[PDB]
């Protein structure tokens, strides 16, 4: 399984006596076991691209051939760990060496083999039974939140010949043995899957269930769906933290994966420092977010292969848990950094560049990356279902949208949560642009909304009309000063302000506004629009002659009602239950309609 | 037929990108197909793109990841990719490799046709002289579709070009006041787009006359440049051997061009613009020109090769070279879509080369050509007036200018705006034309002779 | 018409970028002139 | 002096705003289109240089192999 | 006779097609006939040369094209020309070449358009922005030129005489309109003199009624020369009389502004625009010339009543 | 004592001319004399380097120039300054170098202009608009600089 180094021209190492090797196989070059891949082959010689520095590699050094291509090691212990882009545990490398550096040629197993996991068989299988790929034959108890279901690796099947009894096993033991056509396969709790291959599913289903983030904006006006794909701008002042924390903390997904692609060292530190400090209430207990999270960390000075592979390692980990029946939400901190890594490799290989210097296949790689997301029917007899969502961010040089990476991304993702910096400067959070943002899942969710909430859909339509009209009126107001302006337009302007102030704006540093349940979001919007409609009628039905109602009359007449509408965001779901908050909102509507009644 | 056993080789010389180079090959044939098995049993195929002496260069469709140098086993079929075709392919769903994915059987061939096809003898090619009624006023009036015409829709990411194509599939008829067999190549698209069309075809109740070829975003990029040829090869069988009228729709042709560009870079071919091969035009012609009627046979092929324009750049090589090959384009844009206008078809930068033959006495109505040309003049001038008024202000305009703004505003909401299920006849479209043209006095309708105005203008 | 029709060059980039900066500066200075005239106009209007 | 100093202000504003609008709607868009055109064409020239240099390096490699 | 080598046919054959075509043309030239061949592409031929040069692994020149692209185009076009033929019978013939070019994006900067313009003596540039307006033929008329104007001046004087000063005045009007359009976009037609407004509107008259024609109609499918110069004479005669009308009155006690002549002579402006609808096949030269003569008289009489 | 080399002379002499000139300059520098060396053009030197780099079929950098263009110009430009000479007499001489970059334009992206600017301490840029207006000597005086201010302040 060894060959020899024939020569080094830089980061590219030529091997000889390496006839038995496949393209994009893995090699460990030299006495330090440098990680690299085989790209070009000719005769019994192979051209190796080495990820790390090749200084010190000699002619005649050994090359160890590893049969598996670039792959992710999947099994118990994946949760709570931080990985390199090529699946190297950073929390073990820093703790097994007492160093601050990642050793050159470091070789730490992705999943430690010194942990004795609590494994319980499915108790449904027997020796002699038939098992197929994707089947679950036992569960490992990792923590209080996520059960780690042990699946038969894809592309394997047969009759079960041995089942381990319940007990404490590590990742190097044998848990299940199966025989197919006389060939016996001994399986541990760990499976390996090539990172560039898509894990098969029974069928790919439409995405219909909303992604229940805690923000009123980026939900009511611009829905995302479990299994859907969106894009988030990444600029210093855009306030992207709000989405990252809200999505990872309060989402209705089961597993969070955060993927770095190649960011500034200090930015990776902020993410690695923040995440371990995040908690959420679960069964009444406050639990660490890292018990249901996995994180992949890559800084700009990491090997380019890892920065390019990081995005595929992340989604491979996501699919692994998807196949368990979990809903997984993966965030790519910057897909622009990934695209930069991809262009660097294309340049290093002297490939013909295309648009703005990027590889010709940039678009194909992004399209095939995002296509891997979605709600699926899983493999295996348990007939379970799950999904992968992607909320990958874009940060093109200059902030422009002409960069092929952002332009291609926007043509692929179905939701765009356009953020802005001006809003942040005005201290308006979350910093959502509104006019640029869009969601193409609105039709997919119409069945969910009709079934569970009924009035939500016409309300969000009216809300967009009111907000858009406020923008449309901007030129008239600037040139007029609200003097030569219709009273019906004054209602739109002031109500749109109410929406912008006490609905779309959300203050995550307050205990009552940490998470806004959907029923509260639609409750608040219903009463605000119901007021809008009543105010429009109050003016229009009396605007003929003699005695007419104006906005100044409405505002002065029922100022307490306009205040009560603004006060609605303070209804803390932790102390005031669903029935109490709905009851208070129902009373507000009645008080509101009755206040208008006195005007007619 | 080929009675001699095929040879199998384990003589792979080396692998460089997507190209697997074999040596020790007996009398290599150019553009022949090779079937290869990987050490793990995976089967893949490729085509010989170069032969020299005992060497041959095979481009592998599925990809070259996992291809070995010592254990790889390859066999040469001894012919070009000739594909099985039969009449009963209608109602079947295939992948981009020509294999079924609808849980039905493989194709039980009536013959084997060369995927590359053959050029139709221009002396027997018959010039199209029949109009298709698309039901869309923006098309039937000002950019008519002939049977045998090649008319792509130039679009942009996020625009409803999939809905327009779907609409056309159901309400495409004749102006002779007819069941088209649709062959739909869904390449470089996501699941939802392919499922959208698949569902629509069943919703229309026409699935028994629809043949699908799917190659999704997560499928190999090399198969994406034979999928159109598979669709067209079937269309040619149906149209020219079984005299069936076929409508062939190729989804975002830009995924074809991008797949081709990747191949061009891999083979180190001479670039033209934006990194695309200098022969991109010739390759596109091989795809596009498989259309039109043939004298003496009652079939036809009509194409709608919709394409996405990168960054809305109408001069991008993809729409540019297509524009040189096809008989014009429909062209949709964001300025109409951003105002919730459907279909968002902008007539100004559009044209139909076969439209002049398609309109008029014996085809539709004698005033057709006159109405179209004047609508173009009035629409374009209204756009020019907006460009002026944006700077000088409304007060700087005279009555001659305001009339064009009135036309422009009424034109877009009356002529272009229709709705996904609004099916207008070509005669109704012209009647609407006149209703808008009558906004102006006779003296301003300078594209229409008085021999036409005196009859139609009074109404 | 659509372009100033200067042959592509790095020199053209420098000239066009300087020309753009000049146009943007003039736009902002004239906008301030307009705002000053508009305020005075409205004041004259009030009196 | 109000009316005679006023209509002259309305005329001065209309002239100033018209010039500002032209800079915004005519002159700058035209400069931006020109600049974007230049940027694209320069990258196209960079590519054809890349092609030739790559082929030169390959031809040198072929000569070197023949010499061995 | 015609040669077909369509876009989806072998790319190498595109070179043989061009050379076969011109060789055929020369053959008939030698027989005493005037040949006017046209290859509708040129760029497709140069494209074939690029694809072959690539397969040959040749060193490319500008934009991937062979260094000898200019050599092939020069030797092709120079086979045109009026000649005295070989052969005792003393024949006289010619081959003209009218070759299309397909610049990508409409940008006249590619090696094929650039090399072609250095070879051909007449440049019929087309403007995509005119075609979008269905202003056909889409001739730019600002960047086009013909270097045979001086050669034909003798011909024109022999048969027409009036044509040449009309050609000159027409170019001055169109160029003056362009010079004004540049500033009018910014001013808004506020600072225009009455003499300039006449130029702008007469230039429109020329553009809409003279420069464009619908080749798919019984009346514009063919435009006999006598009709072109006839209706041009009327359009220029209007220009001179309208410009005189204001020039002689601007300093008087009533200036004939465009709005006065426009309302007073609106019927003349319509008649001038109708001059295209003459159907030369149904109505021959005698009726067309008499009709144009009547429009000139109608103008002169209306001017006498105006000024 | 001048060194004469015209554009129609061999490319190697076009390259070597600068080296010959500075060799004579240092020779007299070591006598304790103050030497002032004026070049007619260093863009012609860079042109010679581009021509030879091509002829040698070595990998070029920007605009066809050798990647080491900066090293050749630095080698020439750094052979200057006030020095304490070798030899018993303790004499001190100097060489001043005045380069000359022929401007394809006012864009300092020009490989020769850029490499020169990174080395030379004083840059006397000549404005195109002042030349067109016949303002002589034509110096931009806004884009020019001299880095010897603090040295001369004493």
Swiss-Prot record, chain B:
V-ATPase is a heteromultimeric enzyme made up of two complexes: the ATP-hydrolytic V1 complex and the proton translocation V0 complex. The V1 complex consists of three catalytic AB heterodimers that form a heterohexamer, three peripheral stalks each consisting of EG heterodimers, one central rotor including subunits D and F, and the regulatory subunits C and H. The proton translocation complex V0 consists of the proton transport subunit a, a ring of proteolipid subunits c9c'', rotary subunit d, subunits e and f, and the accessory subunits ATP6AP1/Ac45 and ATP6AP2/PRR. CDD domains: ATP-synt_V_A-type_beta_C (cd18112), ATP-synt_V_A-type_beta_N (cd18118), V_A-ATPase_B (cd01135). Keywords: ATP-binding, Cell membrane, Cytoplasm, Cytoplasmic vesicle, Hydrogen ion transport, Ion transport, Membrane, Nucleotide-binding, Synapse, Transport. NCBIfam families: PRK04196.1 (NF003235), V-ATPase_V1_B (TIGR01040). Its main location: membrane. InterPro entries: ATP-synt_VA_C, ATPase_a/bsu_AS, ATPase_F1/V1/A1_a/bsu_N, ATPase_F1/V1/A1_a/bsu_nucl-bd, ATPase_V1-cplx_bsu, P-loop_NTPase, V-ATPase_su_B/beta. GO terms for biological process: ATP metabolic process; regulation of cellular pH; synaptic vesicle lumen acidification; vacuolar acidification. Non-catalytic subunit of the V1 complex of vacuolar(H+)-ATPase (V-ATPase), a multisubunit enzyme composed of a peripheral complex (V1) that hydrolyzes ATP and a membrane integral complex (V0) that translocates protons. V-ATPase is responsible for acidifying and maintaining the pH of intracellular compartments and in some cell types, is targeted to the plasma membrane, where it is responsible for acidifying the extracellular environment. This is V-type proton ATPase subunit B, brain isoform. GO terms for molecular function: ATP binding; proton-transporting ATPase activity, rotational mechanism. ATP binds at residue 353. It is a peripheral membrane protein. PROSITE patterns: ATPASE_ALPHA_BETA. Belongs to the ATPase alpha/beta chains family. GO terms for cellular component: apical plasma membrane; clathrin-coated vesicle membrane; cytoplasm; cytosol; extrinsic component of synaptic vesicle membrane; melanosome; microvillus; plasma membrane. It is found in: Apical cell membrane; Melanosome; Cytoplasm; Cytoplasmic vesicle, Secretory vesicle, Synaptic vesicle membrane. It comes from the Eukaryota. Pfam families: ATP-synt_ab (PF00006), ATP-synt_ab_N (PF02874), ATP-synt_VA_C (PF22919). Expressed in brain (at protein level). Gene3D superfamilies: 3.40.50.12240. It comes from Rattus norvegicus (Rat).
